Design a protein around this ligand. Structure first.
Ligand SMILES: [Ca+2]
Length: 286
């Protein structure tokens, strides 16, 4: 009966969120569930580079506009992204080898997307999956052609394009304080923020095997130690939809003042009926 997003707001957090897209909002009972239980929606695909700028200069916003308008009309916060990362990246971008050209292309992409939705977007994932597992920077086209300054540039461009949005760097496999990747992103966000880079948040996307949720009790505090005003959580997957892993992640967020909420990607079975993880989360937040 009770809404998870309502319950998490009552514990002082901002949102319980879900990642969806136009195709699912128009099918059956998807819109109703989202209205009842979630306070934020994110486009799963409609805002990625190969969706929005499949050919340079030729932007496609049909699906993203649909999601944004639906969320606005139904009072849902909007997260969007990812602006800069190696996935969903057309080959016309990764074939570029000229530094100033790539700088201009990356700025045009950031500025066109954020300007279109200026003032409407709570969180922009500006840079995604920038780190290797060993803590070194991922050798995507931006790093190779621009260098490591592409991460500052991308964040300064976004801040200028829409100063109202919270700007996030996001990555996966940050679920343990013992991982080199978790420590490296903290150290580097610290350095970037000291040099004035407007990284408002770190988003931890979690591919959880059974038992890895406990790790977040110690990793989320470590991530919050980079000093961003916000951190957040995305549940990409949980092995066996294990209730205990879900509850530990929720409790990690409740323990970290700067954690604003949790998003799940797509807790419900094929007939849109709550699963045990659902009930466990509600009972924990109750
Ligand atoms: Ca994992």
């Amino acid at each position: 009966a009770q809404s998870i997003d309502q319950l998490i707001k009552a514990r002082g957090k901002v949102y319980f969120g879900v990642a969806t897209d136009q195709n699912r909002l128009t099918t059956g009972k998807n819109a109703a569930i989202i209205k009842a239980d979630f306070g934020m929606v994110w486009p799963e695909e409609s805002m990625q580079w190969d969706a929005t700028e499949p050919s340079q200069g030729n932007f496609n916003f049909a699906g993203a506009d649909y999601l944004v308008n639906w969320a606005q009309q139904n009072g849902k916060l909007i997260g969007a992204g990812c602006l800069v990362w190696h996935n969903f990246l057309p080959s016309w971008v990764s074939s570029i080898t000229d530094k100033n050209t790539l700088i201009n292309v990356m700025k045009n992409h950031i500025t066109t997307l954020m300007t279109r939705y200026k003032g409407k977007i709570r969180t922009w994932d500006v840079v995604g999956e920038a780190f290797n597992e060993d803590g070194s920077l991922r050798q995507n086209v931006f790093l190779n052609v621009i260098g490591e300054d592409y991460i500052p540039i991308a964040f300064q461009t976004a801040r200028a394009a829409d100063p109202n949005a919270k700007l996030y760097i996001m990555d996966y496999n940050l679920d343990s304080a013992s991982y080199p990747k978790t420590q490296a992103i903290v150290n580097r966000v610290k350095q970037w923020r000291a040099a004035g880079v407007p990284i408002d948040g770190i988003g931890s996307q979690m591919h959880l095997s059974a038992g890895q949720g406990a790790g977040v009790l110690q990793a989320l505090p470590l991530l919050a130690s980079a000093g961003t005003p916000e951190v957040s959580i995305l549940m990409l997957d949980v092995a066996g939809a294990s209730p205990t892993d879900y509850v530990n992640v929720v409790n990690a967020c409740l323990n970290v003042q700067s954690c604003v909420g949790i998003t799940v990607m797509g807790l419900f079975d094929g007939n849109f009926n709550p699963k045990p993880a659902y009930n466990a989360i509600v009972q924990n937040l109750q």
